[PDB]
Design a protein around this ligand. Structure first.
Ligand SMILES: Cc1cc2nc3c(=O)[nH]c(=O)nc-3n(C[C@H](O)[C@H](O)[C@H](O)COP(=O)(O)OP(=O)(O)OC[C@H]3O[C@@H](n4cnc5c(N)ncnc54)[C@H](O)[C@@H]3O)c2cc1C
Ligand SMILES: Cc1cc2nc3c(=O)[nH]c(=O)nc-3n(C[C@H](O)[C@H](O)[C@H](O)COP(=O)(O)OP(=O)(O)OC[C@H]3O[C@@H](n4cnc5c(N)ncnc54)[C@H](O)[C@@H]3O)c2cc1C
Ligand SMILES: C[C@@H](CCNCCCCN)NC(=O)c1ccccc1
Ligand SMILES: C[C@@H](CCNCCCCN)NC(=O)c1ccccc1
Lengths: 492, 487
């Protein structure tokens, strides 16, 4: 029954940073137990056509003005002049299947009214009250209704579709998304990590190799009345430590409050997680941001921008319904009055050619599409067939021609490979990250997690902290937080 | 008299409209000028075109109540009273040309970041210029050379929101959120007229320059225009601009009101923590439109230098940045200028150009020298026309050409005069580094005493410096007085 000072479950960035902090503080005899055959967790870099590398999990350093993880990276690059990231924010190109490009349009002025909708939402909630949540969709309808006298038909038709790019930030359809949580305050530009794995490896490299135990799935954690904690890997292995920092995803941890021990990733807690933790799961959920990588032979399209969003189909009928609806109740009725296509929801494409010089498109998708697409990620023919219409429309707007299917080995773009994410089906992630359905209050979880199960059983991860909640750097900071409190306690 | 309203600006006119709406009678509005409207004035130019030489937009249309009242009237009678003219800004540099929506400069994106940096830094108080310098030094590792060069010139469009150069402007008050889009009033004089005739015309007394306001502990206020006539009223609502009112706390100038007793301390102290901006306007009227109507918003950037970059790249800390930086002649390229292309939004062949201090006072001074004015702005006008797929400007101001129908022909220039009008002495409330506009607001909101009140764009928090702000302040003081008397 090997004795350890600290047992960290999960080798994601939280777990990795927690072990880093522990070592950095002189603490010895710690362990990092990871279920998968790799470290990184939701930070994973995959290889595709010709050795091209892509981050299939997180790709950006957000809030570069305050992001501690980013500043740390930025310093290294200032000292050795090595390119670790690239600021790739750009003027968004918006594409409708019909009206073509609708961005920066002298008549539509979509970005302008979008800015107003944003201020409208802020005014709607920033106004401290028992305001009451609703879906993001309902919030946009309420905006259209209140400002219809000041909007053209075209604005009422396309604005709603254009503002849905926010779905790609939460990984949720606007009808499943909480209005109160939709608008986040970006604190500066984003920086595209040129290998998030290099961030993972650098932190992993900061502590004892022998501390890492890969392919070990923790099944249960027990608190001994005799002040200490017992942990069981699935392969018989048993440990007992003074402290444990649990970093498994909110979705995996959620399995704990359910009866059935035979679930890949689920941990049996003894005593079971306190009611404040269990109940918090009813107040926060999990989104499904997913990715699809489209690799072409050569860059043969306009690199006017690295940011392109394809709007879902809209209809003149909708405008009419908005002009004639006498109120929000009636609007929903009139709206209620087939089958999902690549045009049934907005899709977000990153033109990597401009940003990194690679002839590939990194596309983001949201729930429910992500689940369906990830489910057929092996049927490459079906994937191409599904994304062909939009891939073409984009090439059309970027001065190129229809895409050619070259997946089974001049001016025409030829698709070589297609890589799809698998976060919703992977038992050790079960989705992308924490997100809010309407009525959800993310603070309940953050409080319950950061206050721990008890003095010895702690938590870290993107879902356990306010600043950078959902983000890689937030997960990172939570790792540091828990390790610091513990190294201080061990210091005594 | 029941209540005496000093000033026929929108604050004063609303106060009268309200007092009357509340059955109050026997009231007077004493205006020093020979017209009502104050800093709201629509002038007439070439071919009868009309322009607001004073305020021209309804800001914060999401919450602006004056705007909402105007929108209802239009929903009911269908008359156009305004148009939403926000547009994608076109940014023009003398050497480089258009630098907006640039796939490599992406200036709007760093401008936005700069904006967030400003919010973070103030969550002390320098000049907007200094704030911009800190940001440049602190983020240079993530900025390209051209961004370091052009962004600071682009971000200065904010000088036209305040009517103050970036070295005179308080960084703390530079950025201010907008409650939604702006709407161009198609006749602010319509707003003025509607409110003006919503009370007994015989209440209005034009060309009355109130010279002194006296309060006797014997529950009464005595006001007398400088032409000798004296008035005694229960309540007094003073709406003269902050600039004019600031003459009281000093020793005969035109417009100055002699208060007896003097203005309490809290008020006199407030003039120390709040100042006045000088937003100005120049109207360029062309024969007809012969340029591209891509956008209605065009800003010309002051010139920039690569030596400024090297200084940013080389500066050790913030203190040495200054040194290297503190190392003449004024031209149209010495500051950013904001041009509203009226053709796209109103169908009129004219540009409404906005300017700031220190430049405003200088151009208004030579407002009658058409030749001088055309010569000063010619370069930026040609640069604009070029960028808008047109030709250099032809001076057709002297009525007589025949060789046109191809190039833009300037037919007239109209300049504002707010900095030289003794009754406005500037444009509106504005902050210098170190100011705190809240003191003047509270000082004004509470008043000198129960019978010597204040109204005006400078006496309110929401809509501060705006036409609706002034409007609301007029209703405020009005109501409080309506209640007290209807008692
Ligand atoms: C598609 C996608 C795109 C995203 N894009 C960005 C972005 O651009 N920028 C950004 O900042 N964030 C982004 N995020 C979020 C970011 O990836 C996460 O916030 C971060 O990776 C979370 O790290 P973590 O340590 O909190 O959790 P994890 O990375 O999930 O680490 C938890 C670890 O626990 C392990 N584990 C689970 N169960 C067990 C068990 N029973 N026993 C042992 N080990 C177990 C898991 O294998 C995993 O390795 C994105 C996420 C996704 C999925
Ligand atoms: C060039 C310019 C552009 C602007 N653009 C906008 C804009 O787009 N949108 C917006 O909302 N706001 C704008 N503003 C500001 C707006 O015009 C003011 O906020 C508003 O007009 C203030 O109204 P007021 O009643 O408070 O002051 P005023 O209009 O100055 O009324 C005060 C009155 O008192 C009179 N008076 C002065 N002294 C005496 C005296 N001793 N005796 C009797 N009468 C006296 C003055 O003649 C004047 O009529 C702009 C201002 C300027 C100058
Ligand atoms: C959709 C999101 C995916 C990666 N970041 C997820 C953050 C989730 C925080 N809750 N990224 C973006 O929206 C984006 C948009 C423009 C440039 C760079 C990134
Ligand atoms: C007319 C002036 C705004 C005046 N409104 C009152 C502002 C008070 C700030 N204290 N400027 C603008 O509307 C403007 C708008 C966009 C760019 C530059 C200027």
């Amino acid at each position: 029954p090997a004795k350890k000072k600290v047992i960290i479950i999960g080798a994601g960035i939280a777990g990795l940073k927690a072990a880093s902090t522990l070592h950095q503080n002189g603490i010895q005899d710690c362990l990092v137990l990871e279920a998968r055959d790799r470290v990184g967790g939701r930070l994973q870099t995959v290889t595709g056509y010709q050795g091209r590398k892509y981050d299939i999990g997180a790709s950006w350093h957000h809030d570069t003005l305050t992001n501690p993880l980013f500043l740390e990276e930025a310093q290294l690059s200032l000292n050795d002049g090595r390119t670790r990231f690239v600021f790739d924010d750009d003027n968004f190109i918006y594409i409708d299947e019909e009206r073509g490009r609708v961005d920066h349009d002298k008549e539509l002025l979509l970005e302008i009214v979008d800015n107003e909708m944003s201020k409208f939402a802020e005014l709607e909630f920033h106004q401290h009250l028992g305001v009451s949540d609703c879906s993001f969709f309902q919030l946009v309808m309420k905006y259209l209704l209140q400002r219809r006298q000041f909007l053209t038909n075209d604005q009422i038709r396309y604005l709603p579709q254009l503002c849905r790019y926010l779905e790609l930030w939460h990984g949720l359809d606007w009808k499943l998304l909480s209005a109160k949580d939709t608008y986040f305050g970006h604190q500066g530009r984003n920086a595209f990590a040129l290998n998030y794995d290099s961030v993972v490896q650098r932190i992993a490299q900061s502590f004892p190799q022998n501390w890492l135990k890969l392919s070990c799935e923790v099944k249960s954690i027990t608190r001994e009345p005799s002040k200490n904690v017992t942990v069981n890997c699935e392969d018989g292995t048993v440990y007992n430590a003074d402290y444990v920092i649990i970093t498994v995803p909110q979705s995996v941890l959620n399995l704990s409050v359910q009866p059935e021990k035979n679930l890949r990733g689920r941990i049996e807690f003894q005593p079971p997680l306190k009611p404040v933790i269990q109940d918090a799961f009813d107040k926060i959920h999990f989104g499904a941001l997913g990715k699809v990588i489209f690799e072409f032979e050569e860059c043969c399209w306009s690199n006017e921008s690295s940011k392109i969003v394809t709007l879902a189909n809209s209809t003149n009928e909708f405008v009419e319904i908005v002009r004639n609806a006498e109120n929000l109740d009636e609007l929903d009725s009139m709206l209620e009055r087939t089958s999902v296509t690549c045009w049934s929801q907005p899709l977000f494409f990153v033109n990597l050619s401009k940003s990194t010089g690679v002839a590939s498109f990194m596309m983001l998708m949201q729930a429910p599409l992500t689940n369906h697409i990830e489910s057929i990620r092996e049927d490459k023919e079906r994937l191409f067939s599904f994304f062909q219409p939009v891939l073409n429309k984009i090439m059309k707007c970027l001065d190129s021609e229809d895409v050619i299917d070259g997946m089974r080995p001049a001016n025409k773009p030829v698709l070589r490979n297609i890589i799809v994410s698998n976060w919703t089906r992977d038992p050790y992630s079960r989705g992308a990250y924490s997100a809010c359905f309407p009525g959800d209050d993310p603070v309940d979880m953050v409080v319950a997690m950061s206050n721990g199960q008890d003095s010895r059983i702690r938590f870290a991860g993107e879902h356990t902290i306010m600043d950078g909640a959902g983000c890689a750097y937030g997960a990172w900071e939570s790792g540091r937080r828990e390790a610091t409190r513990i190294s201080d306690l061990l210091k005594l």
